[PDB]
Structure formats: C-alpha cells, structure tokens
From Swiss-Prot, chain A:
Subcellular location(s) per record: Cell outer membrane
The keyword Acyltransferase appears for this protein: no
Protein name: LPS-assembly protein LptD
Full protein: residues contained: 225 to 780 of 780
Similarity comment: family membership: Belongs to the LptD family.
Domain of life, source organism: Bacteria
Quaternary state and interactors: Component of the lipopolysaccharide transport and assembly complex. Interacts with LptE and LptA.
Function: Together with LptE, is involved in the assembly of lipopolysaccharide (LPS) at the surface of the outer membrane.
GO terms of biological process kind: Gram-negative-bacterium-type cell outer membrane assembly; lipopolysaccharide transport
GO cellular component, as recorded: cell outer membrane; transporter complex
Major localization listed first in the record, in broad terms: membrane
UniProtKB keywords: Cell outer membrane, Membrane, Signal
Swiss-Prot record, chain B:
Primary residence: membrane
Residues of the whole record sequence present: 22 to 164 of 207
Subunit: Component of the lipopolysaccharide transport and assembly complex. Interacts with LptD.
Similarity-based family: Belongs to the LptE lipoprotein family.
Gene that encodes the chain: lptE
Cell location: Cell outer membrane
The keyword Acyltransferase is annotated on this UniProt entry: no
Name of the protein this chain belongs to: LPS-assembly lipoprotein LptE
One term under GO cellular component: cell outer membrane
Organism listed in the record: Yersinia pestis
A GO term, aspect molecular function: lipopolysaccharide binding
Function: Together with LptD, is involved in the assembly of lipopolysaccharide (LPS) at the surface of the outer membrane. Required for the proper assembly of LptD. Binds LPS and may serve as the LPS recognition site at the outer membrane.
Lipid bilayer topology: Lipid-anchor
GO biological process, one term: Gram-negative-bacterium-type cell outer membrane assembly
Protein keywords: Cell outer membrane, Lipoprotein, Membrane, Palmitate, Signal
Length: 543, 141
C-alpha cells in the first residue's frame, strides 16, 4: 500500500543541463514492486526509467529498463547516427531455494559504449569499462556441489569487446570427504567452453580434474598440514588458419595435456605472553612457514582465456597459485614465511595486530620459454590498530625486488561515533612498474602513472538540525582532484532534505592532455549515506 | 611466567545453525571449527550447549581509485558476516566480521578478472571464518 507519486527531485549537470525526476510507485503485490520515472534532460531528451522488484522462493531480484528515444547530442560510435535511442537493461537475482538450490544473476547490457558517460544509473558509472552478464544455477549439499554458469561481458571499446572471451557454458563441481582414514579429501572439476567474437581468435574446450589429499594435524597451540594435489587438464583448441599464419602469434596445439603434481607443507605456531609493565594485556607471536613445490611444464602451446596475474597481499603470500583461471600453472619451489603479532586487552579484544611475511625462491618460477632470479624476492605486510572505541587505523604494503622495491601500499584511518559523526583519511599507492606487470594492456606511465591518491570523507552535525558531508580525493602526481563532493542536509520532525554538489573526473582529452570533469548540483528530499554513496568513489565504512 | 609459552577457545562442542547450511561460507566455518578441535553436533531441542548462529552475509564491490581518464583503477571487495553466540548460562552475544580485498580492474581481460574475483571471494570467506573462531574468545572471557 503506497501506489502514488513520489516527491520529485531535480538537478543541474554540466553535460545535460537541467534535469528533472518524477518517480511513480505502483505496488503490485506484497512481493512485487514497480517504479516508473520520467527523467527530463534539458539538452538530451526525455528518458524513462523502469524498475521492477520481486521476492520469490527461488530468491529476490530487481529488473530495470531505461529508455531514451531521441538523443540530440550523441551522434554515434562511428561518429554518425543522429537521433539515436539510448537504452539499458539490468537484471539482478540472488537466492537459495529449498536450501540446496542456488540461483544468481548479474546481467547488464547497454546500447552503446558511451551510455554511463552520458546517462546516470544505479547500475553503472563513468568508471566502468564494461558491463557484466552472468547467470548461475547450481545444486549443493553437505558432501558435494555443482554449478552451471554463463559468463559474458560487454566491453566499452570495439577492440575489447571483440577480443573478450566468454565462458559459455562453465561447469564447476566439488566433492568433499572428511576422515578418509587420517586424511581429508577434496576433488574439484571443471568443464568450460571459451569463445570470442573475433573469428581470428581460437576457440577452446577445457576440461580439468584436480584431486587433493590432506593430512591435517591440529592442536590448541599451532597446527601443521601436509597436502598432495594433482592438477590434470586437457585442452581442445580450435585454431583458425589466419591465426596460425601470423608473424606475431604463438604456435598453439590442437590437443594439449598438462599433468602437474603439487606438494605443499604448511605449519603455524602460536606463542603468547602477559605483557610486563602493562598488566592484563596479552601479546601473541605467531610464526608460519610453508614449502611449495610444483614441477615445470612448458605451456606456450596453450592460449590465454580466463587467466591473469593474481594480486598478492600478505595473505596471498601463502596462496599456492600465481595466476587465475587454469591456463598457466607456474612452477613452484619456494618457502613462504610470515610472522604475526597480536595484542589483546582486559576484555579479550584484539586491539593491535601486525603481520610481516616473505617468499624465498630456490629456483625461478616459469610457465614457458618466453623469458633478479632467486632468493627472498617478495615481501608483504599489513597492520591494524584499534586506537579507541571509535577510532581505527589500518594499512598494508608490498615489495617485489624484480619490479623495483615497493609496488603497492595503502593506509586508512577512520573515526565514527554513530551514524551522524564520521571522519576518514586514506592514501593509496601503486608503482607504475607494478601496474605494467600485474595488468598489461594498460602499462607504464604513458600518461598513466601508478596510483598516488589521498582521500578524505566526513559527515558531521553542525547545528540543531543541520548536517554536512564532504568527500575529497586528490591525485598527487598529476596534482589534481579525482573526485569531490560537498553536501548539506536539513532535518525537522519529519525526515530530511538534501542539497549537494559533485565534481569528478569523467573523461580524458587526448590533445594537449588534461582531464575532462563534470559538475552536478541537485536537490532531493525522499540522506547522508545516500549522498556519501553516490560518487565514483563511494563511501565504504572501514573496519 | 613472563616470556613466551605455547598455548591459545577454551570450552568445546557447539551447535551450528546457518541461513545457508550448504553454502561456501558455512563450509569454511565448519573447516575452521574442525581445525580448532570443535565437535559440531546435531542435537538441538535439549540445548545446554553453546550455539553459533550465522544470521546472514553480504558482499559488496566499489571503486576505490581511478586513473587520469576517469576509468577505475583499483576495486575493493567487501564481505560482511553477522553472527550470534547463544550460551544457555546467560544472554546472547552478537558478532560481526568484515573482510576486505583489493585488485586492479582490466576491461581487456574481464573474464580473467571475474575468475580472480571468485578466488578472492573464496579467500575472504575463509578469513571470515578464522576471525569468527577467534572472536569466540571474546565471547568467553
Ligand atoms: C599424501 C599427502 C599426505 C600423506 C603424508 C602422510 C601419509 C601417512 O598416511 C599413511 C597412508 O595410509 C592411509 C591408510 O589408512 C587406512 C585407511 O582406512 C582406515 C579407515 O578405517
Ligand atoms: C643459495 C641457496 C641456498 C642458501 C639458503 C637456502 C636456505 C634453505 O633453508 C630454508 C629453511 O626452510 C626450509 C623450509 O621450511 C620448512 C617449511 O615447512 C615446515 C612446516 O612448518
Ligand atoms: C625439467 C626442467 C628442469 C628443472 C629442474 C631443476 C632442478 C633444480 O632444483 C633446485 C633445487 O633447489 C633446492 C631447493 O631447496 C630445498 C628446499 O626445500 C626443502 C623442503 O623443506
Ligand atoms: C575507548 C577504549 C579505550 C582506548 C584507550 C587505549 C587503552 C590502551 O590500550 C591500547 C592497547 O593497544 C596497544 C597499543 O598498540 C601499540 C601501537 O603502538 C606501538 C608501536 O610502536
Ligand atoms: C603505525 C603508524 C603507521 C602505520 C599506518 C599503516 C600504514 C601501513 O602501510 C603503509 C603503506 O603506506 C604506503 C607507502 O607509501 C607509499 C609512498 O611511497 C612510495 C615512494 O614513492
């Protein structure tokens, strides 16, 4: 029961001029909702935004259709369409039916690459480089589970969309069994079909089986775990002739077998003590060591489908995989060691925490022949500190000798009393070389440096029924704001009124460098967090 | 006696209820309880044993940094888990766990990235479980 109009809202943007929102709420059933919203845009046209929410036994979900008939600005991707129709379709679903059935949908499709640049939606932003289209249905009980999936992506560049691989379909299966004698056993399996739009690119069917036997020895203090794993993979790669006769392309093989055994031994111990002058507090000292061995296997005859360099933080030090997917299994012959100290107080609250770890390589990690070689090459650390009941601090850093010392680092401090008072400082750094290594096809600093971003966010009451929010993010190398948000709120017996300004980097001018910004200043009534969660860098509460 | 000794949940044996008993999070929690020598039984009805109730969990993903051209640089995955510890001796002690991960985005390798995300999520779930078990200490005291 609510089927009326909703109080309108308005705004003024640097790209669409004056904008006017007039929402209408339907209320079809206790478990069905709809919203139809004319959205006038001075310079662009009249948009219609439809949102349909449902709640059923297979799960809860939301569908959405945005439709703008006659765009008077857009022209085309090709530079020439004129009077084109802008549209967006969204479907999200999540649910566990009858405890054993599992359904998940994350589908987004737009009419053109420049949609989110020009139009505002809850299902996208100017930071997005593509749209995700994923369907997932699976069964699961205590002993095993299986999952069928369709994974496809709409990349907002011709090149990206053309060469973007799809998983269609993907089958993931897991079988578990404890107490198989002294061991715990686990078998994982996968069957996938990778295809892409570009006819030149190879298609592939990949099958993978991976049994794992585990000997876990646990205690009140410390624990050790021995693990034997078998990685078995078969590839059926269909390779077009045009691909094989390229002067720059790798010689792929039609049928590929890869079988690699993996040995891992991982141990951890927990010392502790009552601190001396400070009585009641406890300091814990937790050493951890892991040896990993995987033999080398040349995999140049396998193409890349779903495989990228995984990003390692302090935890990732003890991860047995370097890459994602299954197209590259690096040889391993290394020891990862780490030390974790904790501090508990009177009430057994973890108040301080610090971890430092490292990886020592006995031999080079390889995946092929396409080649600062051994020793302690990777370092990583993180830290957390509960300064008081309302103030928190945490941060982390990563080093790789092969990429020139420091690669990643970040720190964030946050104060918060209730949900009216909040302050947050943060800094993020990423070396150029790290970006060039971890995510290629977006390399060294050709105008694209590493990351060095300082950020502040706040929400504070200032008068009797007044409230102000702010958010400033600054790029220190380019010496310019990345994002900025200033806001006021007014309260009375009723609820709240919100007024806000926002200026963000939204594009790039190719000639004579410089970045393209956009302005927004608007009003709604229908706050605080709702305004904090609106920019390209929305507020996420730390801790 | 002053310097380092080896020890460190006192009390064992509990009930385990969850909104998603066959979900991956519940599996991680079971693995972790099992690693800490906690016997997970089927009793209910005649409680007089502490219980661990997983109310629910939510996942989040936002952009935390951008490049000069406005495109996303680093993305952050967030896992929230809400739990409750019911001890028959006294009242209920609520628990909450938040886990964070960060990775660079790459529109030219979207599928790969999705894969990466899944891995991350897995790890995060595991980490959550760990904290939960450790937080049982806070419940004890
Ligand atoms: C392979 C990874 C871990 C192995 C390292 C230690 C192996 C020691 O275990 C010996 C294996 O023998 C197990 C057979 O035990 C009997 C199983 O059936 C008894 C159940 O009633
Ligand atoms: C110049 C190359 C060799 C010189 C230094 C080699 C050092 C090798 O010794 C490393 C000691 O650690 C061995 C593995 O650590 C044990 C891990 O597994 C135990 C589980 O608790
Ligand atoms: C088939 C390709 C040829 C590659 C074989 C190279 C073999 C070189 O092995 C060097 C081994 O380095 C010694 C590692 O030290 C042992 C540490 O691990 C001890 C486990 O606790
Ligand atoms: C509102 C709650 C009370 C907060 C007051 C702080 C009480 C003191 O206990 C703090 C325990 O944490 C230890 C501090 O951690 C050390 C960090 O700095 C050491 C590194 O040089
Ligand atoms: C306990 C006081 C300080 C602890 C705060 C947490 C910080 C831990 O992580 C540090 C990460 O800081 C990033 C390193 O700074 C990068 C800039 O230097 C790069 C050189 O160009």
């Amino acid at each position: 029961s609510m089927s009326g109009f909703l109080i309108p809202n308005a705004k003024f943007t640097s790209n669409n001029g004056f904008e006017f929102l007039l929402p209408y709420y339907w209320n079809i059933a206790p478990n069905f909702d709809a919203t139809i919203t004319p959205h006038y845009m001075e310079r662009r046209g009249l948009q219609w935004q439809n949102e349909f929410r449902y709640l059923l036994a297979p799960g809860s979900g939301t569908m959405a259709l945005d439709w703008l008939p006659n765009d008077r600005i857009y022209t085309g991707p090709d530079g020439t369409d004129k009077n084109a129709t802008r549209w967006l379709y969204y479907w999200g679903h999540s649910g566990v039916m009858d405890q054993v059935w599992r359904f998940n949908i994350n589908y987004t499709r737009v009419s053109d690459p420049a949609y989110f640049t020009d139009l505002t939606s809850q299902y996208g932003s100017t930071t997005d480089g593509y749209a995700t289209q994923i369907f997932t249905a699976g069964y699961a009980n205590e002993n095993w589970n299986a999952t069928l999936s369709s994974k496809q992506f709409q990349v907002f560049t011709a090149a990206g969309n053309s060469n973007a691989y799809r998983a269609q379909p993907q089958l993931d299966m897991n079988y578990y069994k404890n107490d198989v004698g002294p061991f715990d056993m686990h078998v994982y399996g996968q069957a996938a079909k990778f295809t892409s739009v570009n006819p030149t690119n190879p298609e592939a069917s990949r099958f993978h089986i991976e049994p794992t036997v585990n000997l876990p020895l646990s205690n009140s203090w410390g624990s050790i775990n021995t693990e034997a794993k078998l990685l078995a993979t078969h590839y059926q790669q269909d390779i077009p002739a045009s691909f094989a006769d390229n002067a720059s392309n790798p010689k792929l093989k039609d049928s590929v077998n890869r079988v690699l055994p993996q040995f891992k031994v991982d141990g951890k111990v927990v010392f502790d003590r009552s601190m001396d002058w400070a009585t009641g507090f406890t300091q814990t000292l937790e050493p951890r060591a892991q040896y990993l061995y995987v033999p080398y296997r040349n995999q140049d005859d396998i193409y890349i489908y779903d495989t990228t360099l995984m990003q390692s933080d302090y935890s990732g030090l003890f991860r047995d995989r370097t890459y994602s997917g299954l197209d590259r299994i690096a040889s391993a012959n290394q020891v990862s060691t780490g030390l974790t100290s904790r501090i508990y107080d009177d009430a057994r609250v973890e108040r301080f925490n610090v971890s430092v770890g490292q990886i020592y390589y006995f031999s080079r990690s390889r995946t092929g022949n396409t080649e600062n070689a051994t020793g302690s090459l990777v370092w990583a650390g993180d830290t957390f500190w509960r300064i008081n009941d309302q103030l928190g601090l945490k941060g982390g850093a990563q080093y790789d000798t092969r990429l020139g010392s420091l690669t990643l680092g970040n720190a964030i401090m946050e104060y918060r009393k209730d949900a009216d008072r909040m302050i947050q400082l943060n800094y993020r750094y990423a070396s150029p070389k790290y970006i060039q290594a971890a995510v290629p096809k977006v390399y060294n600093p050709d105008y694209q440096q590493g990351i060095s971003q300082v950020g502040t966010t706040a929400s504070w009451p200032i008068a009797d029924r007044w409230a102000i929010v702010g958010a400033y993010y600054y790029d220190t190398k380019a010496k310019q704001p990345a994002s900025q948000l200033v806001g006021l709120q007014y309260n009375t017996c009723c609820w709240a009124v919100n007024l806000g300004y926002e200026r963000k980097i939204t594009g790039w001018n190719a000639q004579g460098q410089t970045s393209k910004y956009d302005n927004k200043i608007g009003f709604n009534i229908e706050g605080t967090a709702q305004m904090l969660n609106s920019g390209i860098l929305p507020y996420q509460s730390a801790f | 006696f002053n310097l380092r000794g080896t020890t460190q949940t006192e009390l064992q044996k509990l009930l385990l209820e969850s909104s998603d008993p066959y979900g991956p999070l519940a599996r991680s929690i079971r693995q972790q309880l099992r690693l800490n020598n906690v016997t997970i039984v089927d009793d209910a009805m005649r409680k007089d044993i502490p219980t661990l109730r997983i109310i629910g969990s939510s996942e989040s993903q936002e952009t935390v940094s951008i490049f000069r051209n406005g495109v996303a640089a680093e993305n952050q995955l967030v896992l929230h888990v809400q739990a409750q510890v019911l001890i028959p001796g006294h009242d209920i002690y609520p628990l909450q766990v938040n886990v964070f991960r960060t990775f660079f985005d790459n529109p030219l390798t979207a599928l790969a990235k999705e894969a990466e995300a899944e891995v991350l999520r897995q790890e995060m779930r595991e980490q959550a479980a760990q904290q939960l078990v450790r937080q049982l200490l806070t419940v004890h005291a």
